[PDB]
Design a protein around this ligand. Sequence first.
Ligand code: BCL
Ligand code: BCL
Ligand code: BCL
Ligand SMILES: CC[C@H]1c2cc3[nH]c4c(c3C)C(=O)[C@H](C(=O)OC)c4c3nc(cc4[nH]c(cc(n2)[C@@H]1C)c(C(C)=O)c4C)[C@@H](C)[C@@H]3CCC(=O)OC/C=C(\C)CCC[C@H](C)CCC[C@H](C)CCCC(C)C
Ligand SMILES: CC[C@H]1c2cc3[nH]c4c(c3C)C(=O)[C@H](C(=O)OC)c4c3nc(cc4[nH]c(cc(n2)[C@@H]1C)c(C(C)=O)c4C)[C@@H](C)[C@@H]3CCC(=O)OC/C=C(\C)CCC[C@H](C)CCC[C@H](C)CCCC(C)C
Ligand SMILES: COC(C)(C)C(=O)C/C=C(\C)CC/C=C(\C)CC/C=C(\C)CCCC/C(C)=C/CCC(C)CC/C=C(\C)CCC=C(C)C
Ligand SMILES: CCCCCCCCCCCC[N+](C)(C)[O-]
Ligand SMILES: CCCCCCCCCCCC[N+](C)(C)[O-]
Ligand SMILES: [Fe+3]
Lengths: 281, 239, 300
Amino acid sequence: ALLSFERKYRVPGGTLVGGNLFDFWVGPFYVGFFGVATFFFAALGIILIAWSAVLQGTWNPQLISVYPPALEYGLGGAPLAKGGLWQIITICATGAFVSWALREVEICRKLGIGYHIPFAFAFAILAYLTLVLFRPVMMGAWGYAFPYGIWTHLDWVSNTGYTYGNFHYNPAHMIAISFFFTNALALALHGALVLSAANPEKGKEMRTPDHWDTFFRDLVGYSIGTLGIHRLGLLLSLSAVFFSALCMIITGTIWFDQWVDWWQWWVKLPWWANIPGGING
Amino acid sequence: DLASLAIYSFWIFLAGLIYYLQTENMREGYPLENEDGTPAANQGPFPLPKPKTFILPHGRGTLTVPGPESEDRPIALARTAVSEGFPHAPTGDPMKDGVGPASWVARRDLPELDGHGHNKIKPMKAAAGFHVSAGKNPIGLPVRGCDLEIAGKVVDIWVDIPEQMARFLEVELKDGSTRLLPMQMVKVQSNRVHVNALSSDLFAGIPTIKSPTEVTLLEEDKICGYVAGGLMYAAPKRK
Amino acid sequence: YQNIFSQVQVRGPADLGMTEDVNLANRSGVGPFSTLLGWFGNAQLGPIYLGSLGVLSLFSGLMWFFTIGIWFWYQAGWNPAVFLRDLFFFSLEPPAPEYGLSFAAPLKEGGLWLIASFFMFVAVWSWWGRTYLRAQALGMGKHTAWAFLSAIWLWMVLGFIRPILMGSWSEAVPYGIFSHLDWTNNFSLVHGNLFYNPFHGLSIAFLYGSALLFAMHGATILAVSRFGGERELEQIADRGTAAERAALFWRWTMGFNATMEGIHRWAIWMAVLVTLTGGIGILLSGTVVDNWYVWGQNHG
Ligand code: BCL
Ligand code: BCL
Ligand code: BCL
Ligand SMILES: CC[C@H]1c2cc3[nH]c4c(c3C)C(=O)[C@H](C(=O)OC)c4c3nc(cc4[nH]c(cc(n2)[C@@H]1C)c(C(C)=O)c4C)[C@@H](C)[C@@H]3CCC(=O)OC/C=C(\C)CCC[C@H](C)CCC[C@H](C)CCCC(C)C
Ligand SMILES: CC[C@H]1c2cc3[nH]c4c(c3C)C(=O)[C@H](C(=O)OC)c4c3nc(cc4[nH]c(cc(n2)[C@@H]1C)c(C(C)=O)c4C)[C@@H](C)[C@@H]3CCC(=O)OC/C=C(\C)CCC[C@H](C)CCC[C@H](C)CCCC(C)C
Ligand SMILES: COC(C)(C)C(=O)C/C=C(\C)CC/C=C(\C)CC/C=C(\C)CCCC/C(C)=C/CCC(C)CC/C=C(\C)CCC=C(C)C
Ligand SMILES: CCCCCCCCCCCC[N+](C)(C)[O-]
Ligand SMILES: CCCCCCCCCCCC[N+](C)(C)[O-]
Ligand SMILES: [Fe+3]
């Protein structure tokens, strides 16, 4: 079934591979070659997880966990029962996500829109790839990657963080947090703003964009404008993830000691290091 | 335990929130249709919400959604297959007929008004106090198509007065009439404006505005639709 | 061309804005124009509106900020080199547990924290009132003030409501860059690891989801800006090919979609539920649940 306005847009073309071979839909979903690729990768991955479940000996989603090869395996293969399945599943994940991005590009070409969405999605993919591929490679083992289970991946975040003390002191992690919180703040504000203009006090006419520029200027003395806020949210979000990937790519590699002690470079600068009083003297 | 009651209650709240949100997002485009325009059998598990009415400013009336959906224009496409889910082929020239990525909606044939009731978008020539304040001023630059031929020259910028931004370049063709090109589909360079989406021979086909000092929502939709469509339909003429 | 930065800026007479029921006596003149800002957003700074509630908020907010600063300078022995050196290590700390919820603590050992906190309380609520009132003068709905109330909720929980219910101001967050981070870490350790708080986990889902969502939405609107997508109010009132192509990108990708008004409802809520759930998770911690690992083992 189709949205009332949909048919005009369901024309042939836009595919990157296969010509017309996969140029069709199932229900709402566009398929394409990368739709097919995504189904295969995803379905195999789920099947391998369903199997890796029996080898672990469980069926609760809150207990299923697919743990990577242990550190002693380095960057080599592993028996399925202890690391192999993770490794194949990771290949399947990567395959599915990249295939999902490339399918988004096909959809963009058919619809005559910009490529901003797959471009944005590629930041999430890169963050995933940082944790499971780039960091573990750079550190010499698959075992530093996180396991695929609901609670077990949180155990990993906690143990990884406390390996370096309070992980709050990672400076790239500080920047990342700041973008996350700023992004959510911006999202609240955009949401509320547009809705406040479109749903005014009872009985009144829809407000206009001039009203919402006036609102923000009355309030903080600036309005970024409607093109601006959309650029902004895109930038805050993508920057949050950029800094997240960065903060982990440097941890266990460039820096591997307690993050709190990194801040000593500042306090040990010669012009004030030896001056008595304060906290650090 | 109070925390157990909180979490349980919150999940029930979240389910209601998601239901409310999905039904709110069905105020356009629903009910769903078969490829022939008749109502689909399977609407999904979310019902259409109770209509709301928006009171439009400047005496333009109201919008009540959801309401009776209708394209209000002929769609020049035909089936390529005997069953549901396949593409629909253009029956003529898709750029002219406004289908595919060349599509447009029958938006209202008036210009968008600003908060004081004046036309939102004006040529800069008619916009008092407005000038280029940074960047390369494109006014006067030749305009090049994806075939690397000169399609015309830039004779003004159409600006969004309230948002103080450039929205179109008005481009004069070989025959002396002008066309609007969306600012988002041109690249201002030091010695030219380049237009990737259209080859030079397709500039005359860009839909015209009926009055030279304003543009209607309908007209913006036909222009922007038409130049986006060139990415797919002028690809044979893009070197 | 991607529309992340503008290619040409234009400028005209300062936009002085809509009038509606706003008291014009309280708007300033327009500020300068920033060509820098105008590559990305708008170039115009000001005017700003500053009635009595705004003066109040702005005065208190500065008083909160200076009170922490006087204390920081004091801690630095009034030496500017030491002040810059140790800037992130200073901390204006709340009263010790023994003073409970009283105001009897000495200035140096809790009292300056109550003063700074009192000023913060006045700064935020009056800024909340301003948020509602500025919307009212323009005939707009109160969504901004209701949304701001969710962030206020976490803040009030952290520094006021939860300290009260626990019996002392020592539970509240200290004013310092590193010290408030240590407080956060300590709070999770003392409460049996916040990763086992279901409300904290939901707060994460929403914080992550806000980034997902504003990336989706920002990219989507930028991808359809070649059809006027960003003109969201008029796309609401009169659906265009921008709004149709946006919906269909998502319908074709993930099987469902939003409207131009409805995406903003997903937005306001994804964001608001961050601090809503978050504030609940914090309020329950040590009032009702001492250890989230433990509670989690009983499911309840
Ligand atoms: C005790 C633990 C430590 C700590 C240790 C760590 C560690 C360790 C890490 C972080 C990371 C992060 N931490 Mg920390 N952190 C702590 C305290 C905090 C606090 C806080 C207020 O205290 C905050 C706000 C944060 C914030 C953050 C973020 C900056 C970042 C997580 C987002 C991210 O990377 O997304 C990126 C997004 C992804 C990886 C998602 C990818 C999505 C993929 C591509 C798509 C999947 C599809 C899927 C299969 C679904 C399909 C099926 C259905 C159809 C849905 N931390 C404490 C002190 N933190 C992480 C980071 O930066 O990682 C790079 C990280 O590894
Ligand atoms: C980003 C930094 C850390 C990390 C730190 C944390 C912390 C800390 C928390 C979570 C939480 C979650 N994480 Mg995590 N998480 C990481 C990497 C991932 C990846 C990945 C492929 O890289 C995935 C899919 C998840 C998935 C999840 C969800 C199970 C849960 C809620 C997230 C959410 O709403 O996100 C935003 C996205 C949306 C709102 C869209 C919907 C996403 C849905 C919910 C994903 C379903 C995943 C499904 C259960 C498993 C895969 C399905 C396959 C088909 C088999 N995490 C990395 C390693 N994650 C929270 C939790 O409650 O854990 C129990 C939590 O507190
Ligand atoms: C070791 C530390 C613990 C931990 C301890 C805590 C604690 C403690 C808390 C959180 C909280 C949160 N944590 Mg945690 N957290 C951990 C691990 C993580 C990880 C991770 C990957 O490891 C992540 C992603 C998070 C993420 C999160 C967020 C979802 C949540 C905060 C939401 C928010 O926007 O707050 C930011 C928003 C505010 C603080 C609201 C502020 C509003 C006020 C009104 C603003 C006033 C401004 C003022 C006047 C200044 C004016 C400025 C001028 C105008 C310039 N945590 C570990 C396990 N976390 C908070 C929460 O809700 O938990 C349930 C919280 O209290
Ligand atoms: C870069 C900024 C942010 C962002 C952006 C973003 N995400 C996106 C997009 C964009 C622009 C999309 O276009 C795309 C989308 O379609 O969204 C609806 C997507 C998407 N972001 C998603 C999730 C997601 N994004 C996250 C993060 C973020 N996404 C950032 C904060 C997170 C977090 C923070 O944890 C999650 C969970 C998906 C909903 C969707 C991509 C769907 C997809 O790739 O589908 C194809 C693959 C499958 C259907 C299943 C694959 C199954 C695997 C083979 C097995 C599972 C392996 C996995 C590693 C197990 C992990 C278990 C967990 C318990 C840890
Ligand atoms: C839904 C939850 C999210 C959210 C939402 C939210 N926040 C909001 C709102 C909303 C909906 C508002 O309406 C309100 C607002 O006005 O936004 C623009 C606000 C707000 N969110 C704010 C901050 C904020 N929000 C945060 C978080 C969040 N806000 C969540 C992520 C955080 C975090 C992550 O910690 C912060 C720090 C404020 C900017 C603003 C409320 C303003 C306020 O209450 O101010 C009182 C104080 C003053 C007016 C004066 C203070 C003076 C300064 C302390 C001096 C600073 C000096 C400066 C650093 C030097 C440069 C200047 C020199 C020339 C002197
Ligand atoms: C350059 O020098 C000068 C002097 C010019 C300066 O001005 C410099 C000053 C500084 C260096 C200032 C720097 C200040 C900071 C580093 C501030 C940082 C603050 C935080 C990180 C705060 C985080 C969290 C705070 C929270 C959660 C507070 C909540 C407070 C409340 C909910 C309010 C509670 C109210 C109370 C307890 C009083 C109630 C009393 C009644 C009578 C109602
Ligand atoms: C976390 C966000 C999850 C949102 C899930 C809501 C899915 C709604 C799907 C209904 C679409 C029905 N259709 C396709 C018949 O319209
Ligand atoms: C938290 C993850 C939830 C994922 C749910 C995704 C919903 C997709 C809905 C597609 C509509 C399908 N059908 C067959 C109802 O049209
Ligand atoms: Fe928007």
